Amino acid sequence: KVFGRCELAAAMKRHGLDNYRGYSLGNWVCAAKFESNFNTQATNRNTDGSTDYGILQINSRWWCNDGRTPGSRNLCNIPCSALLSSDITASVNCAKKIVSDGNGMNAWVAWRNRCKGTDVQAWIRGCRL
């Protein structure tokens, strides 16, 4: 599923991400825009052999099992394919564990490089929330 900007914002709000660990909703929408272009089916392979999955590009080296990342942990205890669903619940639940692990949203390179320190509230402007 390719989300609309306000559709995704409303969905993330309903799943408890607004101000989760202090990160306003616009941060999460901005990260999803630049990680996946709002596409729940996005996948990208990394040089180390791991793969990033879904709307928030969650990585198989640490967070999900895809059966082909040897020595990987599965800290969200989920198959990576569950992160590609049109239902974002599994991606959101896993992201809550990632953002809590001490490094905040710096775990998302596109957030660090394209959202951090910008006017992220623009990402939810005009949305009915």
- Residue ranges in contact with Cl ion by CB under 5 A: 24-26, 109-110, 113, 121
Residue closer to Na ion, measured from CB, 40 or 60: 60
Active-site residue 35, yes or no? yes
Nearest to 64 by CA among 78, 54, 50, 52: 78
Residue with smaller CB distance to Cl ion, 90 or 107: 107
The catalytically annotated residue of 7, 18, 48, 52 is 52
Q: Is 72 among the residues that bind Na ion (CB under 5 A)?
A: yes
H-state helical runs in the chain: 5-14, 25-36, 89-99, 109-114
Q: How far is the CB of 23 from Na ion (least distance, A)?
A: 24
Distance CA 41, CA 55 (A): 7
| Dist. CA 60–CA 54, nearest whole Å | 11
Q: Just list the catalytic residues.
A: 35, 52
